[PDB]
Design a protein around this nucleic acid. Structure first.
Ligand SMILES: [Mg+2]
Ligand SMILES: [Mg+2]
Ligand SMILES: [Mg+2]
Ligand SMILES: [Mg+2]
Lengths: 217, 206, 129, 125, 87, 96
RNA sequence: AGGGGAUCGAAGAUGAUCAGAUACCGUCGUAGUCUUAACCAUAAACUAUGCCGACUAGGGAUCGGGUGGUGUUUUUUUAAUGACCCACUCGGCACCUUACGAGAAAUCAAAGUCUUUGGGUUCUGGGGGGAGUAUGGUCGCAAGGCUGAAACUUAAAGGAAUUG
């Protein structure tokens, strides 16, 4: 079983937070992967890459493993994680823990018109990491996901349907590529489009409506 | 949105001036220029203590508004602040970190010093830098006691006073706690001066 | 030297918006900067702005909300046939829904959608979103 | 090096930390006391611990050690409150009911609109 | 954000910063929310009524958080004669 | 200003600059110098008949020693000698 | 080509040693080094960062000018100056912090305002060698400079950072 150690965890296990949308709205920093687990039940992982890495520790040569792992709803949530461990399944385990932790929303919207569900992206976005840039552009519906394998998996596992990409730099380093792409989808919720201009009233944190609850013993 | 009561009292002002909270350091960050009232011919600046006051009232309203009076954290590695803060904690029931702030006390749930505030108050935003830096990693509002040359990075509601002299320090802390308790109801009326002396907050060494 | 006024104006505005300031002090001003700003305003990308006389050529103080991701000037004011607009808007703006590539036509300065409606075209000033 | 294993040092530390009274400089009574207060599985290791509590007991009668003494702590808690001056430096009585202050500070007080007993001691460089 | 049937279709309308009107996003762990207490005539603050502000991590890092808070509060009735519109 | 003229009546400078700059491409230089028609042994064709001048036992060492069973062939149309590989053939019982 | 020719000193002349810590080292020393009239046009000629313009953080310095002060030192009887001190101000000059930003990184107030890509303009580069070579043209008394290939060859050559 699992014992929360964070005043966000006890809030969750006591079913005081329904969705992640309440985590994300108030930017409450996750540190207990079980949070993501309960709030996102239908999260399907995927090991993107596994790599033998040669460690040299105090004249003692060892062989470890670096694993690049992606996770996501096929709705609006992604996660990416890199981890190095001493054993392959261990690496993958830890990797999924990390990507669980850094889960992000996504603003997916329309191309031009406005029928059915939002299929593509809302605006053009761009992430950069390392030397790599990855750019994502709204497609029209049924244009599929136009990207190389890796970035394509990352976007599929994030419930994108139709999206043109343009990369640049040494895209052969898949960790920088994935990282950058990750950034670019992780910027969508960050581009003030006119339909978000209307002033809201500031919501009151879960941390204060349920403050007596989930307080340390 | 505050009554004719909360205005600065002659007595209060006397306390302040007695403890030279009005004496600001020699240099002014462009960020705290509005606080500066005038500059003396020797190169020492003067603080609008009216503003010191109103910022005290503000910090108090905030410290008040927090649901669980345990979550608020007073901090100081600064010598004088140790003594003062401890008392602050006592009368206000907030949690205190005197002396050495262990790194990762706001990240890292594994260490034993792990705490999850909902407001940090800090004596010196320079010597206590790391606590501010670390609060910044986890959405924790900082309310500091800044001189006119204190880094106003990652602080909201600065209280312009004098981080140097112990009187200023103790006095400000004490005034702070007092205002908080006046807000909670703990010190019923507002005409009644605190039965407790500010000197309890002062730093004493044998 | 100062070769385009519009360029430095919009540059100032942009930089200021990035810093998250709330007002900028453009200098100098022009019939063009004025019109460009009026179009910026009509769609509410900026608040209200004031022209300051000084007999030379005025300064301007622009107040801005925060709705401005980037405005810019496309530089050599290329000509644009009407069918050509589609390509510019396909490059500059982030989305088919919103944004504005604003033109200069013989029927005054205006956003591109007004150019669509009035069925005219001319040269291309800059772009807002 | 006859460095006492961590069990002996830790047990000495704790035993003196809560049972400072009944221990003296003598090992012979600290030993049978270590029999009556503690449950050590061996006589040798009990002689170890009781002998090190003997040495440490000879070190605490001269000065205060890095450990915990409640006999001290109660008075360290009283001391915090003990000296609250009847008339601090912040009571005006310390300067004849007047506040010694600069021309500019007086300007400030005048601008706030506050009536205070101020002596304008002018300053320069 | 709506579709044709007139129904909203986002994950969430996000919190905007109050000083800067820019969006606060979900990974921004330097952003912050400030509850200030509404007070009675008796000088007691009510347990559950706040004037609350939002601040982007940007503004707090840049060290303008304070001055921003001042202006905001002063305009929203909390303070008076702290913050000048002129400098 | 990104170091190129950006003016509306500036085309000539732009395109001229482009022409002077395409000579650093490799293939372009091959293609306008007629290197294929002047130097390349094949003369710019996908194939050439030749007659085997001499059976060559070249030996090419690192990192893998090829007991290079290759040939000196002379192309019929140029009278131009060339070396050529004769694949998949262990014994060279095919090419005399 | 004259004048000059102290020093130092490519060339050269002479000695060495004595060993593989090794010829430095020595002593003369011609041109040269200084100049006058002509030439030559090159350097790691470097900030290895074109020029003009706008905008975007602080802090110490300082150099040049200016405005303010019932500021200080200089006595004569008070000034006048002059230096200094404080505040501000254009214009330099370097430094010290950071980053919102950039960058492959070292690092950068520009190397920022760059896929959210367009302020004006000049020049240059397109894997490494072959090669600044061959050829031609041109400038120079010459040494040389400027302009400047191809066949052919090769899987790297290279940057920055990191561990031992
Ligand atoms: Mg490429
Ligand atoms: Mg050169
Ligand atoms: Mg050069
Ligand atoms: Mg080449």
């Amino acid at each position: 079983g699992w014992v929360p150690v964070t005043k966000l965890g006890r809030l969750v296990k006591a079913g005081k937070i329904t969705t992640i949308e309440e985590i994300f709205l108030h930017s409450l920093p996750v540190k207990e992967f079980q949070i993501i687990d309960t709030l996102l039940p239908g999260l399907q992982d995927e090991v993107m890459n596994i790599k033998p890495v040669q460690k040299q520790t105090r004249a003692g040569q060892r062989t470890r493993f670096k694993a690049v792992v992606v996770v996501g709803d096929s709705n609006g949530h992604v996660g990416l994680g890199i981890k190095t461990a001493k054993e392959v399944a261990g690496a993958i385990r830890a990797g999924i823990i990390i990507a669980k932790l850094s889960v992000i929303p996504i603003r997916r919207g329309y191309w031009g018109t406005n029928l059915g569900q939002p299929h593509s992206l809302a605006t053009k976005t761009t992430g950069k990491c390392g030397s790599v840039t990855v750019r994502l552009i709204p497609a029209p519906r049924g244009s599929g996901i136009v990207a190389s394998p890796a970035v394509k998996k990352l976007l599929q596992l994030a419930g994108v349907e139709d999206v043109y990409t343009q990369s640049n730099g040494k895209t052969r380093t898949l960790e920088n590529t994935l990282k950058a792409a990750f950034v670019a989808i992780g910027n969508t919720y960050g581009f003030l489009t006119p339909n978000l201009w209307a002033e809201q009233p500031l919501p009151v944190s879960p941390l204060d409506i349920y403050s007596d609850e989930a307080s340390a013993q | 949105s505050l009554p004719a009561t909360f205005d600065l009292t002659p007595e209060d002002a006397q306390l302040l001036l007695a403890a030279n909270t009005h004496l600001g350091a020699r240099n002014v960050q462009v960020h705290q220029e509005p606080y500066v009232f005038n500059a003396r011919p020797d190169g020492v600046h003067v603080i609008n203590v009216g503003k010191t006051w109103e910022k005290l009232v503000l910090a108090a309203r905030i410290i008040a508004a927090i649901p669980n009076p345990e979550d608020v954290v007073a901090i100081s590695s600064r010598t004088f602040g140790q003594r003062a803060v401890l008392k602050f904690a006592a009368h206000t029931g907030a949690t205190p970190i005197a002396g050495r702030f262990t790194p990762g006390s706001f990240t890292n749930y594994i260490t034993r010093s792990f705490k999850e505030p909902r407001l940090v108050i800090v004596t010196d935003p320079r010597s206590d830098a790391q606590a501010i830096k670390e609060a910044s990693y986890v959405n924790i509002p900082v309310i500091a006691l800044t001189d006119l040359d204190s880094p106003s990075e990652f602080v909201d509601v600065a209280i312009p006073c004098n981080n140097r002299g112990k009187h200023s320090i103790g006095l400000i802390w004490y005034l702070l706690a007092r205002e908080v308790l006046r807000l909670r109801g703990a010190l019923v009326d507002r005409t009644q001066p605190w039965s407790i002396m500010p000197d309890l907050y002062f730093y004493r060494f044998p | 030297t100062r070769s385009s006024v519009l360029a430095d104006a919009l540059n100032a505005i942009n930089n200021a918006e990035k810093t998250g300031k709330r007002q900028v002090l453009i200098r100098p001003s022009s019939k063009v900067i004025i019109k460009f700003l009026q179009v910026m305003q009509k769609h509410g990308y900026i608040g209200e702005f004031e022209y300051i006389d000084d007999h030379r050529s005025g300064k301007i103080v622009v107040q801005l909300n925060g709705r401005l991701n980037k405005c810019g000037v496309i530089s050599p004011r290329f000509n644009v046939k009407i069918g050509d607009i589609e390509k510019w808007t396909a490059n500059l703006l982030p989305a088919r829904q919103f944004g504005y590539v604003i033109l200069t036509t013989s029927a005054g300065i205006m956003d591109h959608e007004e150019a669509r409606r009035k069925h005219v075209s001319g040269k291309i000033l800059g772009f807002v979103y | 090096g006859r460095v006492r294993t961590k069990t002996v040092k830790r047990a000495s530390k704790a035993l003196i930390e809560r049972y400072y009274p009944k221990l003296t400089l003598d090992f012979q009574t600290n030993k049978r006391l270590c029999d009556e207060i503690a449950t050590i599985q061996s006589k040798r290791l009990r002689n170890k611990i009781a002998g090190y509590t003997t040495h440490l007991m000879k070190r605490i009668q001269k000065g205060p050690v890095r450990g915990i003494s409640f006999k001290l702590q109660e008075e360290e808690r009283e001391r915090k409150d003990q000296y609250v001056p009847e008339v601090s430096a912040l009571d005006l009585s310390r300067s004849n009911g007047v506040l010694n202050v600069d021309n500019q500070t007086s300007d400030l007080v005048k601008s706030l609109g506050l009536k205070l007993p101020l002596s304008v001691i002018n300053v320069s460089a | 954000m709506e579709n044709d049937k007139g129904q909203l279709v986002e994950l969430y309308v996000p919190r905007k910063c109050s000083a800067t009107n820019r969006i606060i996003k979900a990974d921004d762990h330097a952003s912050v929310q400030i509850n200030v207490a509404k007070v009675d005539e008796e000088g007691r603050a009510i347990p559950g009524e706040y004037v609350t502000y939002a601040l982007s991590g940007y503004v707090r890092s840049r060290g303008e958080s304070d001055d921003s808070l001042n202006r905001l509060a002063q305009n929203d009735g909390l303070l008076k004669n702290v913050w000048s519109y002129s400098r | 200003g990104k170091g190129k003229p950006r003016g509306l009546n500036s085309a000539r400078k732009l395109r001229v600059h482009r022409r002077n700059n395409r000579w650093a491409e490799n293939n372009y230089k091959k293609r306008l110098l007629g290197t294929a028609f002047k130097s390349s042994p094949f003369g710019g064709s996908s194939h050439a008949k030749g007659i085997v001048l001499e059976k060559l036992g070249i030996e090419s060492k690192q990192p893998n020693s090829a007991i290079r069973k290759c040939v000196r062939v002379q192309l019929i149309k140029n009278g131009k000698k060339v070396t050529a590989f004769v694949p998949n053939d262990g014994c060279l019982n095919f090419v005399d």
